[PDB]
Ligand SMILES: CCc1ccc(S(N)(=O)=O)cc1
């Protein structure tokens with residue numbers, strides 16, 4: 201199956217997922233000079249006060265922190281979005297070294313990692329139906345740079361020892377994703393896709409301009425996870441990022457003048 205190695209990584213994905221060469225693939229490089237301020241964007245609303253996290257899972261590609269999405273609690277609205285999008289999970293992409301790891305780039309700059317908060321459009325009822333729609337998903341992307349520790353990330357870091365290998369999960373209740381945001385909600389937005397197979401072209405991307413800082417020790421613990429399952433040869437979970445894809449017939453809009 202697909203992965204990030206030489207033999208199953210991004211350059212191979214198109215053989216089983218031909219949309220990999222599609223017209224609205226993600227991630228992309230964000231050329232900050234070409235992105236245009238858009239006065240039609242409404243204020244962005246990140247409403248996570250009632251978020252209910254449930255579990256953390258090593259799925260062999262990354263780790264997902266999963267939320268109860270059976271009611272409107274943690275939701276994303278406004279900005280480029282029509283209607284209400286419900287938080288289902290977050291995960292990260294990261295590198296083997298601090299100089300790489302993000303999926304989106306900013307004027308070709310790669311960050312050490314990138315956080316994706318994944319939401320589905322409630323008009324479609326369930327995530328599965330949403331990924332059959334052009335406006336089914338909204339992903340809030342946040343860059344990570346290495347510097348001071350992010351206190352709100354530490355609970356995630358400290359559970360990773362218990363989900364080292366593919367298929368392991370652990371209870372992860374009462375985690376507040378508000379502790380992963382930066383101060384500013386300035387953002388860029390464009391229409392794109394999932395960045396892993398099945399690469400479906402359903403996503404409104406909202407990428408925050410301000411990175412969060414995490415400590416070297418925090419990101420080093422991400423890099424101790426394993427792609428492999430228990431009992432199998434150790435393959436460190438690093439460099440689980442897809443590189444930038446062709447922008448094709450798209451424009452990136454900025455929320456800020
Ligand atoms: C199908 C699950 C899924 C959800 C979100 C992503 S991503 N990396 O946020 O585009 C990829 C895959």
Ligand SMILES: OC[C@H]1O[C@@H](O)[C@H](O)[C@@H](O)[C@@H]1O
Pocket residue numbers: 236451
């Ligand atoms: O035709 C002019 C229009 O061109 C579009 O490509 C831009 O997105 C708009 O902001 C602009 O007003």
Ligand SMILES: [Zn+2]
Pocket residue numbers: 291292293316395
């Ligand atoms: Zn992602």
